Amino acid sequence: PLSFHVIWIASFYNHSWKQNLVSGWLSDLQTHTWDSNSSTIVFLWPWSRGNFSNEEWKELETLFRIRTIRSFEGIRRYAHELQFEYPFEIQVTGGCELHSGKVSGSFLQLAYQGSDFVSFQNNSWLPYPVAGNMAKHFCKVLNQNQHENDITHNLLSDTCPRFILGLLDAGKAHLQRQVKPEAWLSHGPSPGPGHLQLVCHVSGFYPKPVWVMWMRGEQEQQGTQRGDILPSADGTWYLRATLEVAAGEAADLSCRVKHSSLEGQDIVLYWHHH
Amino acid sequence: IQRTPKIQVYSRHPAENGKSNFLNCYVSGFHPSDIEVDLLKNGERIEKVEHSDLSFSKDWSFYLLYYTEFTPTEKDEYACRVNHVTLSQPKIVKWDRDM
Ligand SMILES: CCCCCCCCCCCCC/C=C/[C@@H](O)[C@H](CO[C@@H]1O[C@H](CO)[C@H](O)[C@H](OS(=O)(=O)O)[C@H]1O)NC(=O)CCCCCCCCCCCCCCCCC
Ligand SMILES: *[C@@H]1O[C@H](CO)[C@@H](O[C@@H]2O[C@H](CO)[C@@H](O)[C@H](O)[C@H]2NC(C)=O)[C@H](O)[C@H]1NC(C)=O
Numbered sequence: 351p352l353s354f355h356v357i358w359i360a361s362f363y364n365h366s367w368k369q370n371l372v373s374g375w376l377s378d379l380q381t382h383t384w385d386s387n388s389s390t391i392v393f394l395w396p397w398s399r400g401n402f403s404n405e406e407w408k409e410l411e412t413l414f415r416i417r418t419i420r421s422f423e424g425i426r427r428y429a430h431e432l433q434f435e436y437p438f439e440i441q442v443t444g445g446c447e448l449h450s451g452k453v454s455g456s457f458l459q460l461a462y463q464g465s466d467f468v469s470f471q472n473n474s475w476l477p478y479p480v481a482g483n484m485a486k487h488f489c490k491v492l493n494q495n496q497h498e499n500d501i502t503h504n505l506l507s508d509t510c511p512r513f514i515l516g517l518l519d520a521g522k523a524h525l526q527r528q529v530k531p532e533a534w535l536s537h538g539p540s541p542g543p544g545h546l547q548l549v550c551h552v553s554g555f556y557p558k559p560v561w562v563m564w565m566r567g568e569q570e571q572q573g574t575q576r577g578d579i580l581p582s583a584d585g586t587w588y589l590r591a592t593l594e595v596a597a598g599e600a601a602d603l604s605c606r607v608k609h610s611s612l613e614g615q616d617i618v619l620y621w622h623h624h
Numbered sequence: 625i626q627r628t629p630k631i632q633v634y635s636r637h638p639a640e641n642g643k644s645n646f647l648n649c650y651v652s653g654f655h656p657s658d659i660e661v662d663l664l665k666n667g668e669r670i671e672k673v674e675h676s677d678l679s680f681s682k683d684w685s686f687y688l689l690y691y692t693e694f695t696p697t698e699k700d701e702y703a704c705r706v707n708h709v710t711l712s713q714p715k716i717v718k719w720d721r722d723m
């Protein structure tokens with residue numbers, strides 16, 4: 351499920367206090383930021399430019415220059431009639447998706463206070479049913495400019511498809527890289543009298559797909575509990591896999607890690623009770 | 625809606641006393657975005673701590689990674705302190721190499 355999206359986070363805290371952040375993301379990986387001070391797009395990687403010319407980037411910088419300020423200002427002025435109460439937050443994500451190497455869809459959705467509010471589909475803004483009357487009112491206001499909705503539509507259905515294909519191609523050495531994990535064993539918090547929790551840590555792997563199991567020889571231990579895959583600053587991933595056992599059955603346990611980068615040589619670590 | 629933050633602390637490498645490592649605090653699933661996050665050494669704020677740009681998940685909830693280099697010792701205690709409007713007091717989660 352490969353996607354690219356631009357996010358907007360606009361926070362409105364007070365009468366005269368507010369923040370606006372715009373960034374570009376290839377799934378979990380940040381590839382762009384909007385720099386309002388200099389009014390420019392910041393390329394975080396040399397390949398963030400994709401296959402777009404300098405001229406197309408300038409044009410896109412202008413579009414973001416004008417739209418960021420008009421949207422920020424617009425929401426602050428419409429807040430009273432829309433009944434947006436301070437403090438509030440608006441979030442937007444827009445972009446496109448790839449299924450099996452083909453652009454499958456484009457999207458554009460907006461949230462108010464952490465909940466779906468409106469979305470843009472089929473060349474117009476549509477209210478989320480449970481958001482109520484204020485969402486219908488918001489769309490009434492957004493759908494009043496066909497010119498501006500046609501620009502939005504061109505960017506979702508023509509600019510974005512072109513861009514993501516160019517971005518994955520240009521970034522191919524970074525995104526197709528394989529980094530081997532290291533692993534280690536420790537104790538976890540004790541489940542109670544006469545029992546232990548065993549923990550296998552798997553750190554520094556890329557890409558994200560991984561397999562980790564507690565084992566007794568060739569027998570997978572079904573009590574194995576996988577934690578969330580957690581990020582590290584260097585772009586790699588971390589995972590803990592735990593197992594609870596009676597103290598007297600900790601002998602002969604091991605942790606097996608399989609990853610794409612290991613070229614068939616699984617990491618195997620043995621729990622030492624001696 | 626408001627969502628309370630999940631907080632998870634971990635090192636990049638196996639702990640080894642006297643050798644340089646990275647301490648991480650991943651704060652996720654919160655709303656609104658306004659949050660205070662500190663890494664602590666012996667209860668006391670660590671000064672040069674980096675964090676990722678603010679982002680959010682598909683469910684609209686926010687997430688950040690905070691990290692710094694550090695050197696584990698027998699005596700030194702490390703932790704992540706989080707304040708958010710959903711919490712009545714700041715939450716502290718300790719780094720423990722054997723938990
Ligand atoms: C850092 C990023 C670099 C990435 C480069 C890659 C490019 C690939 C294409 C990505 C497409 C991203 C999704 C696009 C969503 C757009 O719908 C959307 C445009 O919406 C805006 O709506 C306004 C009216 O509601 C205005 O019509 C405004 O136009 S203006 O003349 O008044 O300035 C209009 O711009 N965004 C963009 O074009 C990108 C810039 C986004 C900046 C954040 C704003 C997001 C829109 C929020 C909704 C608008 C609130 C408006 C309040 C009412 C005002 C009347
Ligand atoms: C998306 O919008 C289009 C354009 O208005 C819709 O397509 C039209 O639908 C009417 C009635 O079903 C037809 O008479 C027209 O021939 C259609 N126009 C075109 C260009 O083919 C479409 O129904 C909408 N789709 C959804 C699911 O929202």
Ligand SMILES: *[C@@H]1O[C@H](CO)[C@@H](O[C@@H]2O[C@H](CO)[C@@H](O)[C@H](O)[C@H]2NC(C)=O)[C@H](O)[C@H]1NC(C)=O
Nearest residue numbers: 400401402403406453508511512513515516517
């Ligand atoms: C960047 O790469 C995209 C993806 O290949 C280019 O768009 C394709 O161009 C071919 C032929 O040149 C067309 O037949 C396809 O229909 C295009 N696919 C898509 C998704 O639009 C694009 O030309 C390249 N450069 C720019 C400026 O986008």
Ligand SMILES: *[C@H]1O[C@H](CO[C@@H]2O[C@@H](C)[C@@H](O)[C@@H](O)[C@@H]2O)[C@@H](O)[C@H](O)[C@H]1NC(C)=O
Nearest residue numbers: 361363364365366367368369657658659660
């Ligand atoms: C409005 O809020 C201003 C900023 O407040 C500080 O930062 C924000 C993000 C919150 O985290 C808040 O709790 C912090 O105190 C204040 O400086 C200012 O006094 C406020 N003004 C008004 C109109 O009340």
